[PDB]
Amino acid sequence: DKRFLKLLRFYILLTGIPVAIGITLINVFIGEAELAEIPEGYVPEHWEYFKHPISRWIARTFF
Amino acid sequence: RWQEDPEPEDENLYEKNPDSHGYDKDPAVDIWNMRVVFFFGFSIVLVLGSTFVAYLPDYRMQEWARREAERLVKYREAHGLPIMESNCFDPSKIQLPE
Amino acid sequence: LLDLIWLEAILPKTISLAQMKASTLVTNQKGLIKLYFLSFLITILISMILFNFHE
Amino acid sequence: RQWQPDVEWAEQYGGAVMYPTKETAHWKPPPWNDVDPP
Amino acid sequence: MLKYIIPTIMLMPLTWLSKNNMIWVNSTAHSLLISFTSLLLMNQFGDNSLNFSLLFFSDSLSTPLLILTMWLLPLMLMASQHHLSKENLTRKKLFITMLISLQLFLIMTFTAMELILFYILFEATLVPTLIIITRWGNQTERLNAGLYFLFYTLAGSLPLLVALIYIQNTVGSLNFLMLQYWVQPVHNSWSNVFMWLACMMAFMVKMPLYGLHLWLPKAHVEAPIAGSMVLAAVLLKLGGYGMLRITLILNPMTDFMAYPFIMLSLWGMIMTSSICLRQTDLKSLIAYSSVSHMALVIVAILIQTPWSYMGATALMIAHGLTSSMLFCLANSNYERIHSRTMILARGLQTLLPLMATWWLLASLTNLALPPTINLIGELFVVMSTFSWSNITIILMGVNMVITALYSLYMLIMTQRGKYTYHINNISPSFTRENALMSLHILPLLLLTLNPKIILGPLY
Amino acid sequence: MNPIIFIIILLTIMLGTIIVMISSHWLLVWIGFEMNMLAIIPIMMKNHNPRATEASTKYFLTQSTASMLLMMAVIINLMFSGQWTVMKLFNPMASMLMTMALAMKLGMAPFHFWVPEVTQGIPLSSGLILLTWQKLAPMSVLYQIFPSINLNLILTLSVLSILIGGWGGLNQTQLRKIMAYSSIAHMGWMTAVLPYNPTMTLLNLIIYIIMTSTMFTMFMANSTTTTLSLSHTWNKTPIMTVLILATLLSMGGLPPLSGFMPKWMIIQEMTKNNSIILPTFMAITALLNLYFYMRLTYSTTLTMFPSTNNMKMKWQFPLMKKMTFLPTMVVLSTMMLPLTPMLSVLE
Amino acid sequence: LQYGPLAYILGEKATKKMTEKSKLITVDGNICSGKSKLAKEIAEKLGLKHFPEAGIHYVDSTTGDGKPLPVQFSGNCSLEKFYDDPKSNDGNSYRLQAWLYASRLLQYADALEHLLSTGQGVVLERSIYSDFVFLEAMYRQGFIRKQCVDHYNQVKKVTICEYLPPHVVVYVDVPVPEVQSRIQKKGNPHEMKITSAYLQDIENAYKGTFLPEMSEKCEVLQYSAWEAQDAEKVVEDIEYLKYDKGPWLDQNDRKLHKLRMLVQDKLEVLNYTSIPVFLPEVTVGAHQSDQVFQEFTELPGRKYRAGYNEDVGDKWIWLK
Ligand SMILES: CCCCCCCCCCCCCCCCCC(=O)OC[C@H](COP(=O)([O-])OCC(O)COP(=O)([O-])OC[C@@H](COC(=O)CCCCCCCCCCCCCCCCC)OC(=O)CCCCCCCCCCCCCCCCC)OC(=O)CCCCCCCCCCCCCCCCC
Numbered sequence A: 001d002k003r004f005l006k007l008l009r010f011y012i013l014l015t016g017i018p019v020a021i022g023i024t025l026i027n028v029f030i031g032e033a034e035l036a037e038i039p040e041g042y043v044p045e046h047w048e049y050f051k052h053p054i055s056r057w058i059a060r061t062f063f
Numbered sequence B: 001r002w003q004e005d006p007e008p009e010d011e012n013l014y015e016k017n018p019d020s021h022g023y024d025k026d027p028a029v030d031i032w033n034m035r036v037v038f039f040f041g042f043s044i045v046l047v048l049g050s051t052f053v054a055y056l057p058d059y060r061m062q063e064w065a066r067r068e069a070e071r072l073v074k075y076r077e078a079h080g081l082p083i084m085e086s087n088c089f090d091p092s093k094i095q096l097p098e
Numbered sequence C: 001l002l003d004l005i006w007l008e009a010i011l012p013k014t015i016s017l018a019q020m021k022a023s024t025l026v027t028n029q030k031g032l033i034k035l036y037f038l039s040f041l042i043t044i045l046i047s048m049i050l051f052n053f054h055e
Numbered sequence D: 001r002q003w004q005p006d007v008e009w010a011e012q013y014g015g016a017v018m019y020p021t022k023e024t025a026h027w028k029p030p031p032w033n034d035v036d037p038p
Numbered sequence E: 001m002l003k004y005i006i007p008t009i010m011l012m013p014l015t016w017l018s019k020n021n022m023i024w025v026n027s028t029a030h031s032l033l034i035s036f037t038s039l040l041l042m043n044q045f046g047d048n049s050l051n052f053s054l055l056f057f058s059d060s061l062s063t064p065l066l067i068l069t070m071w072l073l074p075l076m077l078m079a080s081q082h083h084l085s086k087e088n089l090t091r092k093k094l095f096i097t098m099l100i101s102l103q104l105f106l107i108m109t110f111t112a113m114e115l116i117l118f119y120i121l122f123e124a125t126l127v128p129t130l131i132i133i134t135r136w137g138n139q140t141e142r143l144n145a146g147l148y149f150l151f152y153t154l155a156g157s158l159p160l161l162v163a164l165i166y167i168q169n170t171v172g173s174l175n176f177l178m179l180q181y182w183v184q185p186v187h188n189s190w191s192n193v194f195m196w197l198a199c200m201m202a203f204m205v206k207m208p209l210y211g212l213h214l215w216l217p218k219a220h221v222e223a224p225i226a227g228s229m230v231l232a233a234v235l236l237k238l239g240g241y242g243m244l245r246i247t248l249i250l251n252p253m254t255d256f257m258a259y260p261f262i263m264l265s266l267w268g269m270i271m272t273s274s275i276c277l278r279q280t281d282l283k284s285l286i287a288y289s290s291v292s293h294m295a296l297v298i299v300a301i302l303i304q305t306p307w308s309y310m311g312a313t314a315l316m317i318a319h320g321l322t323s324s325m326l327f328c329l330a331n332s333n334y335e336r337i338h339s340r341t342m343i344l345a346r347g348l349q350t351l352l353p354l355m356a357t358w359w360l361l362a363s364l365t366n367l368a369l370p371p372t373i374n375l376i377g378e379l380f381v382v383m384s385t386f387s388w389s390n391i392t393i394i395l396m397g398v399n400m401v402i403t404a405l406y407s408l409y410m411l412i413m414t415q416r417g418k419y420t421y422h423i424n425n426i427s428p429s430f431t432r433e434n435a436l437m438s439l440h441i442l443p444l445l446l447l448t449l450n451p452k453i454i455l456g457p458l459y
Numbered sequence F: 001m002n003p004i005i006f007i008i009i010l011l012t013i014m015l016g017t018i019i020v021m022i023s024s025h026w027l028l029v030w031i032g033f034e035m036n037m038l039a040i041i042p043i044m045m046k047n048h049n050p051r052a053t054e055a056s057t058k059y060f061l062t063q064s065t066a067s068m069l070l071m072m073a074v075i076i077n078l079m080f081s082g083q084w085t086v087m088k089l090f091n092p093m094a095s096m097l098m099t100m101a102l103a104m105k106l107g108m109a110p111f112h113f114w115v116p117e118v119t120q121g122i123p124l125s126s127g128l129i130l131l132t133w134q135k136l137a138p139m140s141v142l143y144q145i146f147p148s149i150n151l152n153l154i155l156t157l158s159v160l161s162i163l164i165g166g167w168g169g170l171n172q173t174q175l176r177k178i179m180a181y182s183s184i185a186h187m188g189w190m191t192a193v194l195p196y197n198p199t200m201t202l203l204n205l206i207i208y209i210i211m212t213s214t215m216f217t218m219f220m221a222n223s224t225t226t227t228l229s230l231s232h233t234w235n236k237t238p239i240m241t242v243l244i245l246a247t248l249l250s251m252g253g254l255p256p257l258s259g260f261m262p263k264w265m266i267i268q269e270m271t272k273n274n275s276i277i278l279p280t281f282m283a284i285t286a287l288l289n290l291y292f293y294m295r296l297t298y299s300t301t302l303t304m305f306p307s308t309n310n311m312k313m314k315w316q317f318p319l320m321k322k323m324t325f326l327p328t329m330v331v332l333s334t335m336m337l338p339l340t341p342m343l344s345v346l347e
Numbered sequence G: 001l002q003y004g005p006l007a008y009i010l011g012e013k014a015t016k017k018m019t020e021k022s023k024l025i026t027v028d029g030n031i032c033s034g035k036s037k038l039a040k041e042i043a044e045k046l047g048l049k050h051f052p053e054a055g056i057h058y059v060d061s062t063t064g065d066g067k068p069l070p071v072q073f074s075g076n077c078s079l080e081k082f083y084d085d086p087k088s089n090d091g092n093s094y095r096l097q098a099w100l101y102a103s104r105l106l107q108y109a110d111a112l113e114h115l116l117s118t119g120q121g122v123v124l125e126r127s128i129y130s131d132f133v134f135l136e137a138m139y140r141q142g143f144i145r146k147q148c149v150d151h152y153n154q155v156k157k158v159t160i161c162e163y164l165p166p167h168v169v170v171y172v173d174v175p176v177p178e179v180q181s182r183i184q185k186k187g188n189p190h191e192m193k194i195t196s197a198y199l200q201d202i203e204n205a206y207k208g209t210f211l212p213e214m215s216e217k218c219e220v221l222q223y224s225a226w227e228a229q230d231a232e233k234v235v236e237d238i239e240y241l242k243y244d245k246g247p248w249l250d251q252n253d254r255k256l257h258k259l260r261m262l263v264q265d266k267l268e269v270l271n272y273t274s275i276p277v278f279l280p281e282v283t284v285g286a287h288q289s290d291q292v293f294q295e296f297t298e299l300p301g302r303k304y305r306a307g308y309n310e311d312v313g314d315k316w317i318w319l320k
């Protein structure tokens, strides 16, 4: 039982720590988008309608 | 009434491999099976999958609708209009029977 | 009373008994040429006298 | 271990018919090679 | 959907061309990869569904059912590889192929745009499921469980085929997107009454509706562990998914045609919850518990309200993870003592402490402890049925009490008390078993953080 | 039989059928049936045992009686129309006689009694011809005269055959009797749709022939004629048990296998005609067929029956029977459903 | 081509290769009757092909690489254990006898196939026609049950009817007291446990049933232990035979073609030796039969059809 919990903890942290750090670095150094009016005669890409950089990247890459 | 093999003995994986993970009798295969389940099950699907779900781009327009409702409420109150009307459709485009 | 009995009885159990009985009726035959062709005569007679398949 | 049919289970399907009745009581399986003795 | 159908098909050659000792490692690894990619289906829009082609589409109802479907396959493989260890290689590969083909039919069933295509795949699931139960079940009664499972389903499904074909002739199309715009009201008449019954009875047997449920406890007690997991987690939800779609074209006749089935469900849930209090077979107790849980789903689908449809979707997903986990928990005991009698092995918490924790969490979800999605879905249905008729809160409330009683009776009977003296082969829990339990409960409890993704199209 | 004589007799069985299918004159249709019956008797008698003689005699009496009724219908038709053209008949009594005659030839209930007996009494290879090729000639005549057929008569025959075939097979352990009752049930489906869409009669006939030929060939491969003899296949050729299982499920009409295609298309055509009760009853009654198909799968593929010690000797020798076209037939028997729209080539 | 209707049509008829030396000869007699020695002398002198008596492992000698297989693939039938414990609870006595009839049936088909394909005669030591003398002896001594005898007669009824009897049957008559004396000199410890009642039963069945039956349809030559030493007189006796009885006179190329199609396909030969008659002696459970069949396929050159086994050196498999 002890070995399983240690293995479970290790593999969650194997990616959980890098993700937690990646999220923090994205939040601090890239930041969120700023809401703005659509400039006259401008056609935003479908992923420019979202605020958080990770959400924008998900929309641009997969959706 | 026949020639039949007796029922086999029940095997315990720990007797021959005390470090067995319960996946396979072969210790090398047993460890690799443990790793793929844990890496792909927990490190990938659960951790990245939860991250992916948390950052979905405005799932089902819920945030857009709130921003849109704020705009409509501001506009309709600045011009004395009702916040909401009982009719969904303009009655001038409806021809009642009779 | 309900789950191991009556719900079992009022459908799956009774249905299977019906088919098993009908199967014995259909297949319990004597293999006699005389009887089979005699039933052909009855069939042809019914088709005309009772059902008017000839019209 | 997993149950598999035994002789008693198999004998259900070796009779002349699947559903015994009084009428077919005397029926017997046909010859293995279809040839009835003269 | 080809990005899921084709890799699912490729799992077959991967299994057959794998080294002898790597069939379980390879199929598990790559079925987990497919499950990962299924999250891309979560691109759901507020107004329109995600319509891939003339054949397949995905909306907020099918998306969670697809993600649950593709998640279960790797879990089923982990759950099956121990009792299949003595099987010869070709038959192991055949067993895995049946599981892969089931996933292939299921993902296609949930995304089929046309109802007759849905019907064919909805029936195709019978074949692999029947083969798994009758070929790899353990006891003599698996042959009869296969027949009851097969003929109950076909008894209702053949009328559905006639009704669907009739609808296509009358309306011109069975494309679900077209039916949304071309649907016409159903006027009272004896013809429409039987059209209603033909459209719904097949799905009622799958749920199963109380009265048509006797096949389910048979199937579970005889099925192998993977057979029970898919049966309980996903196959029962075909009926609910079909009802949620077909009810579109049955209004307003469903207003009064629902009554006999609501009474069966409302009373049935109490009867089957009470039956669980006296079951002697652990697998039979859990199977009866599913009938009680799906009675709620039938009522929610039939009363046809936005809250009830959201509760049904949450309940279908929550029950799938919970019920599957309970079967895996019961199976881990079975692999030690080789019996399903609940009273045989007691006080197991003293011998398997961590496994007793999984039993606790599975029980707590089964009785719908807030804020688990089990409670969210059940609460939404209770909220909606109270508006349907205030008196229903008495039946819903009573069922809550009995559900807690039998969930904890199961926990107290097997985990607490004194261990059976003569049982001395309770070996410590394997990593495989502990991982299997955690891959059920962890996604279940995580979903509490973001319930909206399992609340369906009415959200 | 001398091999060249066997070939010449088979070519005459085929020629008799072909004459029926290409004839425009009722006399030549009658000749086609006479020639076909002349050549089929020797292949039933080829094993010279009392059971074969009884089967040939029972077969001869049934088919000779049917051909006499057919000639009677032809002559009545000549009297009331003064012509021999193969087409709709010009007198209702002629139509009843011709329809009844062809029902006797097809072995449809209540003229079915001979089919299980004759099939049981002749070798498997002879039974394969009797239950497949022999259906072609009567079906091709029904295809041409259906506009004049009495709707009540033909649908009554179809309903009886579906019921009798389904109930009769439940009590059978002999594989040749099972196939015979399965044939009667399937003939019912073919003729139920004939009044509405003849093309669906052809589709059901073609798929039925393919599946029946697959079953008979698979029985011949191992020389099995009883349920228990077939239950030993798992201990000799495991692959065959899987092919038997798939073919039987297809014959049961389960999706997504090929045998679901004709029942699906026949239900469609009838519903387009506002025939709802009849297709529903037929589909439910066909569950009887699925039951004794599934019983065979249980004792063949899904469980392992007891074996004998002498089976070990058979392990050392390969299957030397021809099994002509079997790999192709089994694939068509099971995997054709995605190609269903191809049925229009029969239009 | 492989023999078949086409080869038959293209001129390959049995009567073209057959002569007056195309004969089937079987040597019978009790145990330790010198029948094996005489069988080799008739064969070599007459120019025929000698078949040693079919034993437990005969089928192995004709398939694979010809070496005997582990006993488990013969069902653990043992002739030694039959002498030690003829009344063993395992049912070894009848299981052995049922196995031996099948082996003889296969050998008889082999011998007939050799005769029809080449026209050369063959010499056999006992055959399916005389196999029952051992079954009768076992029953009379209480070694097998009456149900076993019924199974044996069922299998024999639907198998023997297909074949033709020997042209010549040769019987070497040796009284039981001398057989019991010769067994001692041969000095096999297991065979030394045989009793005279068993031997007398074999003698009775031979004289009471076999020879009277074989005379009505074959040529029977009976010799004493002394007379059988002079093989040349025996070979002289055979050559002056008339052959005016038995079915062989009624055969033609058409009937012999049908016979050759049967005997060349061994699975068709052994079809009824495994009729589904659930006798405890010969019935094998599913678990045991599955396990043993799996081991068989793992033996060298036994997984695939002959010629498709890379593990024993077969080549060009991707073009075969
Ligand atoms: C990573 C970054 C990137 C993201 C990727 C993420 C990917 C997912 C990974 C995350 C999951 C990782 C988990 C594995 C880590 C390794 C674990 C380990 O090593 O130790 C093993 C661990 C302890 O080690 P051990 O003692 O040596 O084990 C031996 C025994 O088996 C031990 O047995 P035991 O008997 O001693 O204990 C068993 C059980 C027995 O106890 C019970 O079950 C009683 C249940 C009581 C019900 C209480 C009602 C629910 C209250 C919470 C509801 C939420 C709303 C509340 C209001 C607002 C809250 C803010 O106890 C518990 O489970 C603890 C209960 C904790 C929940 C109760 C509330 C906690 C306080 C409130 C939380 C506040 C939120 C956080 C703060 C917010 C700011 C961030 O034992 C286990 O195996 C348990 C594993 C299962 C953990 C469940 C976690 C689920 C996730 C949370 C979802 C929350 C949703 C709400 C659900 C409410 C529950 C019904």
Ligand SMILES: CCCCCCCCCCCCO[C@@H]1O[C@H](CO)[C@@H](O[C@H]2O[C@H](CO)[C@@H](O)[C@H](O)[C@H]2O)[C@H](O)[C@H]1O
Pocket: A018, A019, A020, A022, A023, A026, A030, A053, A054, A056, A057, B051
């Ligand atoms: C926790 C681990 C998760 C792993 C998956 C996510 C990996 C990628 C995370 C963030 C990637 C960078 O995210 C991206 O940043 C830039 C801003 O710098 C944005 O890009 C936008 O701003 C830049 C300015 O920098 C301009 O060129 C322009 O206006 C536009 O392209 C994108 O809209 C956003 O999607």
Ligand SMILES: CCCCCCCCCCCCO[C@@H]1O[C@H](CO)[C@@H](O[C@H]2O[C@H](CO)[C@@H](O)[C@H](O)[C@H]2O)[C@H](O)[C@H]1O
Pocket: C013, C015, C016, C017, C019, C020, E151, E155, F170, F284, F287, F288, F291
């Ligand atoms: C909604 C309508 C659905 C229609 C579906 C129709 C499917 C019918 C399938 C055929 C059923 C026949 O199945 C047959 O039934 C009978 C009665 O139960 C069973 O009979 C069994 O139980 C009865 C009572 O103990 C005994 O008399 C009998 O000796 C025993 O074999 C047979 O074992 C079974 O082979």
Ligand SMILES: CCCCCCCCCCCCO[C@@H]1O[C@H](CO)[C@@H](O[C@H]2O[C@H](CO)[C@@H](O)[C@H](O)[C@H]2O)[C@H](O)[C@H]1O
Pocket: E016, E017, E018, E019, E020
């Ligand atoms: C004319 C068109 C025909 C198209 C055919 C295209 C594919 C042709 C493939 C030919 C090569 C197959 O190779 C053959 O199969 C398997 C799978 O590799 C090999 O051996 C296999 O053994 C086991 C399982 O069987 C595993 O370790 C692994 O799957 C493989 O090593 C065989 O030893 C080889 O003889």
Ligand SMILES: CCCCCCCCCCCCO[C@@H]1O[C@H](CO)[C@@H](O[C@H]2O[C@H](CO)[C@@H](O)[C@H](O)[C@H]2O)[C@H](O)[C@H]1O
Pocket: A060, A061, A062, A063, B048, B049, B052, E036, E037, E039, E040
């Ligand atoms: C839960 C996590 C899911 C993990 C899924 C694992 C499988 C990953 C599949 C990768 C798919 C990438 O697909 C590829 O990406 C590029 C961007 O780089 C995209 O290329 C283009 O697509 C979008 C629209 O589709 C365009 O508006 C945009 O200009 C561009 O990004 C395409 O979508 C595709 O060409």
Ligand SMILES: CCCCCCCCCCCCO[C@@H]1O[C@H](CO)[C@@H](O[C@H]2O[C@H](CO)[C@@H](O)[C@H](O)[C@H]2O)[C@H](O)[C@H]1O
Pocket: C011, C012, C013, C014, C015, C016, E144, E147, E148, E151, E152, E153, E155, E156, E212
């Ligand atoms: C409500 C819509 C769906 C209804 C479907 C109902 C049709 C029947 C489905 C099950 C068919 C199983 O087919 C047959 O059924 C009967 C009972 O029913 C079983 O019969 C079983 O119980 C009977 C007595 O109760 C015993 O005598 C028998 O030994 C036992 O097998 C057979 O073992 C099974 O072969």
Ligand SMILES: CCCCCCCCCCCCO[C@@H]1O[C@H](CO)[C@@H](O[C@H]2O[C@H](CO)[C@@H](O)[C@H](O)[C@H]2O)[C@H](O)[C@H]1O
Pocket: E188, E189, E190, E193, E257, E260
């Ligand atoms: C678990 C099983 C559940 C079973 C549920 C059973 C539901 C019963 C529904 C009863 C209503 C049936 O549908 C009802 O039938 C009657 C005929 O009798 C129809 O009556 C129609 O034809 C009659 C002819 O006499 C006219 O007089 C009447 O004006 C007209 O409405 C109604 O149009 C329809 O409202």
Ligand SMILES: Nc1nc2c(ncn2[C@@H]2O[C@H](COP(=O)(O)OP(=O)(O)OP(=O)(O)O)[C@@H](O)[C@H]2O)c(=O)[nH]1
Pocket: G029, G030, G031, G032, G033, G034, G035, G036, G037, G053, G079, G082, G096, G097, G100, G131, G134, G135, G191
């Ligand atoms: N139970 C049984 N034993 C048999 C059978 N055929 C041979 N045997 C045994 O095989 C052994 C040798 O058989 P024999 O050929 O007759 O004796 P031999 O040693 O070869 O001496 P010769 O007669 O001169 O050839 C004897 O112990 C027989 O009992 C048989 O059909 N059944």
Ligand SMILES: N=C(N)NC(=N)NCCc1ccc(I)c(Cl)c1
Pocket: F195, F196, F197, F198, F199, F344, F347
């Ligand atoms: N005789 C019938 N009952 N039906 C029928 N064949 N109708 C004719 C309609 C039709 C359908 C498909 C095609 I392709 C074509 Cl050319 C014609």
Ligand SMILES: [Mg+2]
Pocket: G035, G036, G053, G125
């Ligand atoms: Mg010797």
